[PDB]
Each structure stands twice: as structure tokens, then as C-alpha cells.
From a paper:
Confronted by this disappointing result, we decided to take a step back and tried to solve the NORPA CC-PBM structure alone first, hoping to be able to get some clues that might lead us to a way to obtain PDZ45–NORPA CC-PBM complex crystals (the structure of INAD PDZ45 was solved in our earlier study). Using lysine reductive-methylated protein, we were able to solve the structure of NORPA CC-PBM at the resolution of 3.0 Å. Like the coiled-coil structure of mammalian PLCβ3, NORPA CC folds into an elongated three helix bundle structure with an N-terminal short helix coupling to the middle region of the helix bundle. The C-terminal 16 residues (aa 1080–1095) that include the PBM is disordered and invisible in the structure. The packing surface of NORPA CC-PBM crystals involves an extensive surface composed of α1–α4. We reasoned that this packing surface might overlap with the INAD PDZ45 binding surface, and therefore prevented the same surface from being used for crystal packing in the PDZ45–NORPA CC-PBM complex. We noted that the solvent-exposed face of the α2 helix is lined with eight Lys residues, which are all evolutionarily conserved and required for the membrane binding of NORPA CC (and see below for more details).
Author numbering: 865 to 922, 928 to 1080
The structure:
């Protein structure tokens, strides 16, 4: 409900509306980490078979030592594979979500303007109460003031105060109008700064996962 809140990428992530997609993405990846884990035991178990086939005779044969060397680079090649497979998904994760967030950023800022506008118009409404009460209570003062002499006399002074009063409201109404136009402008640009920045923060993230 806050009128000048920075809409950063991290902030965009916390918005309730993105929780559903965020939750889905965390699983999709977790399952793969599980898939990685199975792929490792399966290869690990397969690796073992070779010893039964090869070391049944039992004197360290020259061929076996080379073979075990050959196996190790088959593990580290799958280890290093599983690395890039996760990161590749992480970078691809961002791209799909980024399209969604852009559409959500817009409705977060637009929310800020609608919150401000209804706040502006209410400040307007409050001033008229100040103005309307102000004008009427002054008249009450005319009756209250003893110095009045005649009804024709009472009216004349009221008209004069009625001009001094209106000099204020014209300025007060004009001065307020400027403050609102300025307040919206300084806001409405911050939006188009946070948005020109967002396009290039998403990019900065994808590169971090690039390999």
C-alpha cells in the first residue's frame, strides 16, 4: 500500500503473485537434482561390475590399473556434466519467469499510481472542507463581533473579508495543483527508470549462469 516503493527485481520476486511460479521452479529443479543422484548410483553400480569380471582371478595386472584410471574420468565427466545441466536450467528458468515478471512489474507500479491518485483527490476533498468551513466560520465572526453597527454596515465588512478570503483560495487551489502534477511526475518517471533498469538486471542474471 506504499506510494514510493522501489520496484527492484528482488522485490518483484517477493510479491505474492510470483510465489506460484517461484514454487513450481524450485521443485522442477529439485527433481532433477534427484535425477542426478540416481544417474550417479546407476553409473556407480555399473562401474562395480567390471571388477567382478576383471578382478576375479586375483598380483596387480597392468591393464586393470589403466582401466580404473579410465573409470575415474567417466565419473568426473559426469560430475562436471551434472554441473552444467543444473546451471543451464537455472538460466533457462530466469528467461521464462522474466517474461511473467515484466507483466507483473507493470501492475505493481500501476497500483502505486492508483494508490496515489485516490490519495491526491482525497487531499483535495479535505481542503474544500477547510475552505468551506473557513468561509462560513468567518461570517459567524461578523455576528459575534460587537463593533458592528447596522445591518447595512454588517454586510459591507463581510463582503470585504469575502474578497480577502477568496484571494487565499485561488492561490491555495493553484499551489496544490502544482504539487500534485510535480508529485506524479517525479513518481511516473521513477517507474520508467526502474523499468529501463529491469530489462538490464534480468540480463545481468542470465550471464551469471552462462558457461
Amino acid at each position: 500500500p506504499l506510494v514510493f516503493e522501489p520496484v527492484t527485481l528482488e522485490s518483484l520476486r517477493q510479491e505474492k503473485g510470483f510465489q506460484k511460479v517461484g514454487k513450481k521452479q524450485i521443485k522442477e529443479l529439485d527433481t532433477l537434482r534427484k535425477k542426478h543422484a540416481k544417474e550417479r548410483t546407476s553409473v556407480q553400480k555399473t562401474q562395480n561390475a567390471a571388477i567382478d569380471k576383471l578382478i576375479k582371478g586375483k598380483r596387480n595386472d597392468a591393464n586393470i590399473k589403466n582401466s580404473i584410471n579410465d573409470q575415474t574420468k567417466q565419473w568426473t565427466d559426469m560430475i562436471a556434466r551434472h554441473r552444467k545441466e543444473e546451471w543451464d536450467m537455472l538460466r533457462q528458468h530466469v528467461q521464462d519467469s522474466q517474461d511473467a515478471m515484466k507483466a507483473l512489474m507493470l501492475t505493481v507500479q500501476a497500483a502505486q499510481i492508483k494508490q496515489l491518485e485516490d490519495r491526491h483527490a482525497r487531499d483535495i476533498k479535505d481542503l474544500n472542507a477547510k475552505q468551506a468551513k473557513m468561509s462560513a466560520d468567518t461570517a459567524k465572526e461578523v455576528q459575534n463581533d460587537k463593533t458592528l453597527k447596522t445591518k447595512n454596515e454588517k454586510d459591507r465588512r463581510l463582503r470585504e473579508k469575502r474578497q480577502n478570503n477568496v484571494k487565499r483560495f485561488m492561490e491555495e487551489k493553484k499551489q496544490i495543483g502544482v504539487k500534485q502534477g510535480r508529485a506524479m511526475e517525479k513518481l511516473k518517471l521513477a517507474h520508467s527508470k526502474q523499468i529501463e533498469e529491469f530489462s538490464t538486471d534480468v540480463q545481468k542474471l542470465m550471464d551469471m549462469y552462462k558457461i
